Amino acid sequence: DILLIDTDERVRTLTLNRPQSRNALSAALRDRFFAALADAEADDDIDVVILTGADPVFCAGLDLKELISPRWPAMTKPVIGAINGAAVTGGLELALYCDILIASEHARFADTHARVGLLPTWGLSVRLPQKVGIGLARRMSLTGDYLSATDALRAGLVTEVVAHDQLLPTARRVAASIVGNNQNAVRALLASYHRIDESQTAAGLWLEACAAKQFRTSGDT
Amino acid sequence: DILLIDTDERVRTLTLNRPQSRNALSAALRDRFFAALADAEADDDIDVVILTGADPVFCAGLDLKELAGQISPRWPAMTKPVIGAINGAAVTGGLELALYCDILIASEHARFADTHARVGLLPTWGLSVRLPQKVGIGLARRMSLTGDYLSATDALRAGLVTEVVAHDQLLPTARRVAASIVGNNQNAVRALLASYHRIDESQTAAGLWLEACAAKQFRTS
Amino acid sequence: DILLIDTDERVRTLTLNRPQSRNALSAALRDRFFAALADAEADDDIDVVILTGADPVFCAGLDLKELALPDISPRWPAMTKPVIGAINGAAVTGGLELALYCDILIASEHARFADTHARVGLLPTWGLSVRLPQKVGIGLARRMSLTGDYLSATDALRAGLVTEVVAHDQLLPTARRVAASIVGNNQNAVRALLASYHRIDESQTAAGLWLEACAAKQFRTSGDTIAAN
Amino acid sequence: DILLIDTDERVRTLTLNRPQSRNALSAALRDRFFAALADAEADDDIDVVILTGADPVFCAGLDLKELISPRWPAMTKPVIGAINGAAVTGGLELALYCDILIASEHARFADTHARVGLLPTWGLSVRLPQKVGIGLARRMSLTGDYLSATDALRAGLVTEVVAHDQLLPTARRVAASIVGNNQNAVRALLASYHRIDESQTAAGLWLEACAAKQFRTSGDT
Amino acid sequence: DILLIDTDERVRTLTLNRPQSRNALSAALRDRFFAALADAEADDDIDVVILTGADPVFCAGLDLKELAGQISPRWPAMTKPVIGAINGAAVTGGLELALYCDILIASEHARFADTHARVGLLPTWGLSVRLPQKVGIGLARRMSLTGDYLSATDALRAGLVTEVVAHDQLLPTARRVAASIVGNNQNAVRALLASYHRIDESQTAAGLWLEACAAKQFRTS
Amino acid sequence: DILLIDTDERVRTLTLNRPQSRNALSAALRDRFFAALADAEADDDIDVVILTGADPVFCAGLDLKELALPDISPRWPAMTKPVIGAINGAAVTGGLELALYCDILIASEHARFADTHARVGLLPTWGLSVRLPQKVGIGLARRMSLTGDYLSATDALRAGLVTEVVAHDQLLPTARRVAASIVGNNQNAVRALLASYHRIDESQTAAGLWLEACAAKQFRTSGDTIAAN
């Protein structure tokens, strides 16, 4: 019940559904989510994944009341992020994993890693400056403040800002455009994009992971 | 005829001229254009090159009708700035032509699109590398997978073009920018741009190689 | 006096104070500025640094009056404390490179950005050819570098060069508000995260920074060679 | 008849067989060779490829009397090079593609690209300094002189130098060691090695290809 | 007991001490060893660290028997040179321990091997990156796929170890090298090594990330 | 006189000629050597350059007698013509870096290699921390750098640092034979290929070279800071 799995015209929709916890990523939810992603990639009759949250929050990150390794699988099928509300810390990283982002007017983005005293391990310190710019990323990370939907459109984090009631329709519309194209070309091309992006981000992703472990180790002392 | 060549105040203007074929890059036009670029680079009496198309289309890409009866990169190393005056639609191969330019200035009528996935080809002129680097990851992947048009204003918002002007002011604006460059220290200008090109390829080389191998691999199947 | 140094609520403000010379970085000012940054990094009572200029100019670059073709090495030290650049006016050439060094930029409505290296006959050595396209985009950086024309505050905003454009008298207060909410954070996590950001950036810009320096060295060598004949 | 295809205990042996042309790589031989490689990778009951030449020459390179693009496919199965004799220019590049090299006492290595007035396009200028050292590679490439089997062992180009009659037995012995191991681990590990090597060589491979095209273009002038 | 710790003339000697388990890295031994390294790095009265094993085995790798009843990298950033005195077999995980050292000196009895493919695991301590970088591509891939032993002299020939000495001269030789380092300007020594480490990771970071992802991906299946 | 310049069969030989000072690179010698290389690159009648030293030493490095902590920028120019290093004797520190700059090394039986940077209290600026491990291996380079001990000609041979070790009186003749068979090649293809080799190497060493320079700048800064107190 914590993850809603929908299939509609070769589009797989994943909805984070723990709204009483701001859709926080518990161990059970993380397990089911990444398994769902792998299930979609293996599924021959699925072409596009849409990622969204149950209103009013997208994902507030990992469950803090409950409590690490990167688990997003290698995919040839596009994941569209439909950000219905606040994407915070761990949830911001989920959004950064996506190929295409689409925001509601009510979407907000924040990185509170430094506030809660933990260092990122899901590529934020690489992908955030990559997709919003260096200056803004450092401002977001160091302050912990919210970025607005309009500011996210101006910075390039999202491709479009739509009225709340048209978030999911807009996402299926883009998804339909992808399903209409040559699938083999689409997947080979996306695979190329991923491969190229991987070549550019790999060194940074390793440096992030080192900084995180060293911070944890230094903390234990 | 298919390529018009003008010289004025140390500025070399190259105009794609197959309006009945939407300035599509035929074998003939390619050989002229790339020979024309080498001509300008070798000419000390030339400091700035302006690339544009005959109205209303900039370049519809490669002539895929000619290929139906029958593509490594050929853009030569240059120390002279190439200004793209995008007068209309720059699609697929024509988009890559635009991506090659150092500076892009758009008409109100200018629009951009990648239809590689519609026609079952993978790019070989740096699109999967230059497009994300110039319009952002999210927007680039949305353009490549849907095949939809990006407008002039959205190209301005995303950083693809440096300016959007009234249609009859397109080339006057381009020649004005050119005049500023022609106004500066040419040794410094050429040494600086050479450094820019040097630094850029130090960052895109690996990606360009991966794009090429993906294309070859895809052609093979 | 040519450099104003203020401390308030764990925030160190550095003000370039040669207004009669448009805050041009003379030899004496470069020595004191880079010394000031090192102090801030070494001072345990400092968490955030604010860099700004005395009105109406932020910084017009190197003092070209007081200097064969001048070769100037980069001196900006490694830091774990964030540096906020409050761009109050014109940031030109060398001053533009000072701004690109900053972690966070906040622009006045009067802020302007320009690169006149090609116009005076020198190649950059403080990271411009690497950082400028990194932060404003490739097309915009090359247009700026080759023309020498000014980039406005609002154009800089949509390009990503600055995070915010505020009314002129709100510039410093905005810079201090951002500083305060950084100061209000976990300082171990802040400095560990910024150190990480710097490391990742360094691993991405190193090759470029070297190629810039070589191109500069190679350009000065020709210039002297030509001049001596 | 120009390529000998052998299958023995899950080991696929490819023998270049145009000894009257020093096993030169004609168009027909290149077509059959790379198809053979792809056939071996797709073959489920094949674990290892052994590459060798018909005595007394390994491969003298491309057929010059007859007359370009890299065609070596992505593989998860190990290719062992059994160098029976002279590996020259194009043939040296074939040897450099292999995962493991084993030399006869009669094996020799030479790069005559500069002598015949053509620039390499199969990774020599990247892989040769990678596997024999920078100083030796530049000496080989600039002079065109032969490298001895013993000097190749001292430089790291080959892993072992055996008596001529034990070249192929030694190769099948190593091949048998690989067939004896966990295949899934072996292939995943080799795939990792290839991926890592690709990240380090991609930028160079693209720069080589550019230098080659620019040399061809400059030649036409 | 499982890890002996000696201090002599500003040299810190770390001796793996589970000879009944062939110095296999159990959970206990790992925690001691990596804590011991952090101790040495923090101690200003220490300039050089010597890593060695209790005869006749250096380190048989991780204790896979302990794991049978139940592995991210943990080697900390150091400005002090770590000398590996390989006294015997350095296998798999123990090989990676050796690969971490700045300087390797081998006994006549020292031998090296990678059995990751025999036991169905993929490396996580940098083997697929450091092994090829230190013994060459061809030799590294032959070692990883066959699981065979590389001898001391062949390790000397390939560049893995800087020297091979008589067995009773192993540690005297190591302390002699250490004494030369202890003899130099320590600020310069530590600044230089820090630069070496910096430059090295600038070249291996991407590869280390790829190794980690390959391991995780392989574990997943 | 401190630099001997010979031309024979399209081969330019450069001989470091300060034997009484172990061919130490003084300010005057550095100026003339790097000027000589540029001439060779510019001379259409030259195809190959040979660098060697007057016996018994190849080069003992920078003249430390004639010089706060000295900062020396890299000056080795971009070249499309191969440079053969005929290592006749000791190549120490700075002289070691001269050798690593060469495309091809040929060692005398008397050739020795050492790095004494750590011993005299300076960090390298001519590419040692990047090129030395690139050409002799990581373990061997670090052992060399941290100890300052000598590497012998034959040990250098098996490590890959030199392509060949010959009898002393055969050194130059060997270097000329290699040169002659380069000269006997297609000179367009030779220079296009070497230019390509250099470009690929540059794209692999740039980041490292920048990190070396920063580490050196950062080390000198501390050294002066400590000394001034």
DSSP collapsed to 3 states, chain F = CCEEEEEECCEEEEEECCHHHCCCECHHHHHHHHHHHHHHHHCCCCCEEEEEECCCEEECCECCCCCCCCCCCCCCCCCCCCEEEEECCEEECHHHHHHHHCCEEEEECCCEEECCHHHHCCCCCCCHHHHHHHHHCHHHHHHHHHHCCCEEHHHHHHHCCCCEEECHHHHHHHHHHHHHHHHCCCHHHHHHHHHHHHHHHHHHHHHHHHHHHHHHHHHHHHHHHHHCC
DSSP single-letter state for residue C127: S
Cβ contacts of D206 on chain B, cutoff 8 Å: 205-206, 208-209, 212
| CB within 8 Å of A187: residues ≥ 6 apart | A76, A77
**Do β-strands F90-92 and D160-162 pair in parallel, antiparallel, or remain unpaired?**
unpaired
Please answer whether residues B152 and B89 qualify as being in contact, where contact means their C-beta atoms are separated by less than 8 angstroms.
no
B9: left (phi over 0), alpha (psi -120 to 50) or beta: left
Residue D71 CA to residue D48 CA, distance in Å, equals 19
Whether the CB of D199 is below 8 Å from some CB of chain E: the reply is: yes
> The tokens of F123 are what?
């960090």
**Do β-strands F11-16 and D3-8 pair in parallel, antiparallel, or remain unpaired?**
unpaired
CATH number at residue C166: 3.90.226.10
Q: What CA–CA distances, in Å, run from F22 to C29, F61, F62, F139?
A: 42, 9, 10, 28
- List of long-range contacts for C30-36, beta carbons under 8 Å, 24+ apart: C30/C62, C30/C75, C32/C2, C32/C3, C33/C3, C34/C75, C34/C76, C34/C77, C36/C3, C36/C5
Give strand pairing partners of D15. D4, D52
Residue E48 CA to residue E50 CA, distance in Å, equals 7
Residue F89 CA to residue F52 CA, distance in Å, equals 9
Residue type, E171: L
DSSP single-letter state for residue D84: -
Q: How many domains does chain A have?
A: 1
Chain center to CA of C18: 16
Residue B115 CA to residue B99 CA, distance in Å, equals 15
Using CB atoms within 10 A of its CB, is residue B220 exposed (0-12), middle (13-18) or buried (19+)?
Answer: exposed
Over its C-alpha atoms, chain D yields an Rg (Å, rounded) of 17
Length of chain F: 229
| CB within 8 Å of E4: residues ≥ 6 apart | E13, E14, E15, E17, E54
DSSP single-letter state for residue B13: E
Give the residue on C whose Cα is nearest the Cα of B102. Answer: C139
Residue F1 CA to residue A108 CA, distance in Å, equals 73
Length of chain B: 221
| CB within 8 Å of A36: residues ≥ 6 apart | A3, A5, A14
Closest CA to C30 of C70, C74, C67: C74
Residue B10 CA to residue B181 CA, distance in Å, equals 10
3-class secondary structure per residue, chain A: CCEEEEEECCEEEEEECCHHHCCCECHHHHHHHHHHHHHHHHCCCCCEEEEEECCCCCECCECCCCCCCCCCCCCCCCEEEEECCEEECHHHHHHHHCCEEEEECCCEEECCHHHHCCCCCCCHHHHHHHHHCHHHHHHHHHHCCCECHHHHHHHCCCCEEECHHHHHHHHHHHHHHHHCCCHHHHHHHHHHHHHHHHHHHHHHHHHHHHHHHHHHHHHHC
Between the CA atoms of F5, F8, F13 and F19, what dihedral angle is there, to the nearest 10 degrees?
Answer: -60
E157·D159 Cβ contact <8 A: no
A207·E208 Cβ contact <8 A: no
| CB within 8 Å of F67: residues ≥ 6 apart | none
Question: Count of alpha carbons within 13 Å of C187, Cβ hemisphere only?
Answer: 11
Cβ contacts of B198 on chain F, cutoff 8 Å: none
Q: What CA–CA distances, in Å, run from A30 to A75, A187, C74?
A: 17, 25, 46
What DSSP string runs through C148-204?
-PPEEHHHHHHHTS-SEEE-GGGHHHHHHHHHHHHHTS-HHHHHHHHHHHHHHHHHH
Closest CA to F10 of F44, F61, F62, F46: F46
Length of chain E: 221
Question: Count of alpha carbons within 13 Å of B157, Cβ hemisphere only?
Answer: 17
* Cβ under 8 Å to E: D residues 50-69: none
Residue type, F121: G
DSSP element (H, E) containing E60: none
Nearest to C197 among A138, A144, A145 (CB): A138
Residue A146 CA to residue A111 CA, distance in Å, equals 8
Using CB atoms within 10 A of its CB, is residue D45 exposed (0-12), middle (13-18) or buried (19+)?
Answer: exposed
Closest CA to C141 of C164, C117, C120, C122: C117
Closest CA to E180 of F148, F39, B62: F148
| Max Cα–Cα distance, chain C, nearest Å | 61
Q: What CA–CA distances, in Å, run from B43 to A16, B14, B186, D221, E119?
A: 61, 14, 13, 15, 65
Whether the CB of C47 is below 8 Å from some CB of chain B: the reply is: no
Closest CA to E162 of F157, F130, F133, F137: F137
Residue given tokens 């123990």 in the structure block: E94
Residue B87 CA to residue B53 CA, distance in Å, equals 6
Q: What CA–CA distances, in Å, run from A187 to A182, A183, D62, E57?
A: 9, 6, 35, 50
| CB within 8 Å of A8: residues ≥ 6 apart | A172
Whether the CB of C197 is below 8 Å from some CB of chain A: the reply is: yes
Residue D33 CA to residue D90 CA, distance in Å, equals 13
Residue C138 CA to residue C160 CA, distance in Å, equals 12
Chain center to CA of A156: 15
Whether the CB of F120 is below 8 Å from some CB of chain E: the reply is: yes
Residue B126 CA to residue B215 CA, distance in Å, equals 11
Nearest to E116 among D131, D185, D191 (CB): D185
**Edge-to-edge, what's the strand order for the sheet holding F48-53?**
F3-8, F11-16, F48-53, F83-87, F104-108, F164-166
> The tokens of A74 are what?
């290698």
Cβ contacts of C138 on chain B, cutoff 8 Å: 133-134, 200
What phi and psi, each to the nearest 5 degrees, are found at residue B197? Answer: -60, -40
Chain center to CA of A110: 13
Whether the CB of F70 is below 8 Å from some CB of chain E: the reply is: no
DSSP element (H, E) containing E7: strand E3-8
Length of chain C: 229
Q: Around Cβ E65, how many Cβ atoms within 10 Å?
A: 10
Over its C-alpha atoms, chain E yields an Rg (Å, rounded) of 17
| CB within 8 Å of E146: residues ≥ 6 apart | D174, D177, D178, D181
- Those chains having 3 or more beta-carbon pairs within 8 angstroms of chain C are A, B, E, F
Q: Around Cβ E163, how many Cβ atoms within 10 Å?
A: 18
Residue given tokens 């230059």 in the structure block: B130
DSSP element (H, E) containing C52: strand C48-53
Closest CA to C21 of C62, C67, C52: C62
A193·B144 Cβ contact <8 A: yes
> The tokens of D11 are what?
């080991």
> The tokens of E110 are what?
């020292």
Range of the domain at B135: 1-221
* Cβ under 8 Å to C: F residues 200-219: 202-203, 206-211, 213, 217-218
Residue given tokens 């161990």 in the structure block: A27
What phi and psi, each to the nearest 5 degrees, are found at residue E5? Answer: -125, 110
Technique used:
X-ray
- Those chains having 3 or more beta-carbon pairs within 8 angstroms of chain F are B, C, D, E
Residue B150 CA to residue B106 CA, distance in Å, equals 12
Give strand pairing partners of D4. D15
Coil, strand, or helix at residue B173?
A: helix
Residue C74 CA to residue C213 CA, distance in Å, equals 10
Residue C172 CA to residue C179 CA, distance in Å, equals 10
> The tokens of C138 are what?
């490739």
Query: How many residue pairs from chains B and C have C-beta atoms closer than 8 A?
Result: 99
Residue given tokens 């479009």 in the structure block: A160
D197·E132 Cβ contact <8 A: yes
CA triple D5-D7-D8, angle to 5 deg: 145
Length of chain A: 221
Residue C188 CA to residue F226 CA, distance in Å, equals 27
> The tokens of E51 are what?
């890593």
Please answer whether residues B209 and D206 qualify as being in contact, where contact means their C-beta atoms are separated by less than 8 angstroms.
yes
Does the N-terminal peptide bond of residue C56 adopt cis geometry, omega within 30 degrees of 0? yes
Chain breaks after residues in chain D, where C lies over 2.5 Å from next N: 67
Cβ contacts of E208 on chain A, cutoff 8 Å: 206
Does the N-terminal peptide bond of residue A56 adopt cis geometry, omega within 30 degrees of 0? yes
Does the N-terminal peptide bond of residue D56 adopt cis geometry, omega within 30 degrees of 0? yes
Chain center to CA of A74: 14
Question: Count of alpha carbons within 13 Å of D202, Cβ hemisphere only?
Answer: 28
> The tokens of A207 are what?
């440096």
Closest CA to E115 of F126, F83, D185: D185
Closest CA to D214 of F152, F55, B75, F217: B75
Coil, strand, or helix at residue E94?
A: helix
**Do β-strands E11-16 and E3-8 pair in parallel, antiparallel, or remain unpaired?**
antiparallel
Cβ contacts of C161 on chain A, cutoff 8 Å: 135
Question: Count of alpha carbons within 13 Å of E207, Cβ hemisphere only?
Answer: 25
Residue D171 CA to residue D209 CA, distance in Å, equals 32
Please answer whether residues F147 and F117 qualify as being in contact, where contact means their C-beta atoms are separated by less than 8 angstroms.
no
Residue given tokens 């600055």 in the structure block: C162
> The tokens of E144 are what?
């990883």
Is the Cα dihedral D207, D211, D212, D214 positive or negative?
A: positive
- E strands, D27-144, are 48-53, 79-83, 86-88, 100-104, 108-110
Residue given tokens 């996210």 in the structure block: A152
Residue C161 CA to residue F132 CA, distance in Å, equals 40
Q: What CA–CA distances, in Å, run from B59 to A126, A171, B16, B160, E5?
A: 36, 30, 8, 16, 73
B177·C147 Cβ contact <8 A: yes
Please answer whether residues A67 and A86 qualify as being in contact, where contact means their C-beta atoms are separated by less than 8 angstroms.
no
Q: What CA–CA distances, in Å, run from F63 to B67, B95, E162, F106?
A: 66, 57, 31, 25
Residue A25 CA to residue A33 CA, distance in Å, equals 9
Residue B164 CA to residue D166 CA, distance in Å, equals 72
Residue D93 CA to residue D70 CA, distance in Å, equals 10
Residue B86 CA to residue B108 CA, distance in Å, equals 9
Whether the CB of A70 is below 8 Å from some CB of chain E: the reply is: yes
Residue type, A17: N
Residue given tokens 């809660």 in the structure block: A116
Residue A131 CA to residue F102 CA, distance in Å, equals 43
> The tokens of A221 are what?
């002392």
Q: Around Cβ B147, how many Cβ atoms within 10 Å?
A: 22
Nearest to D207 among B205, B212, B213 (CB): B205
> The tokens of F126 are what?
């001519």
Closest CA to B100 of B10, B11, B33: B33
Question: Count of alpha carbons within 13 Å of B62, Cβ hemisphere only?
Answer: 20
Nearest to D202 among B74, B76, B210 (CB): B210
Percent helix, strand and coil across chain C, each rounded to 5?
50, 20, 30
Nearest to A204 among C134, C181, C200 (CB): C200
Please answer whether residues D110 and D132 qualify as being in contact, where contact means their C-beta atoms are separated by less than 8 angstroms.
no
Cβ contacts of D154 on chain E, cutoff 8 Å: 157
Residue type, B190: R
| CB within 8 Å of C149: residues ≥ 6 apart | B180, C114, C143
Residue given tokens 């068979």 in the structure block: F181
Residue given tokens 């480490």 in the structure block: E197
Closest CA to A153 of A136, A172, A171, A139: A136
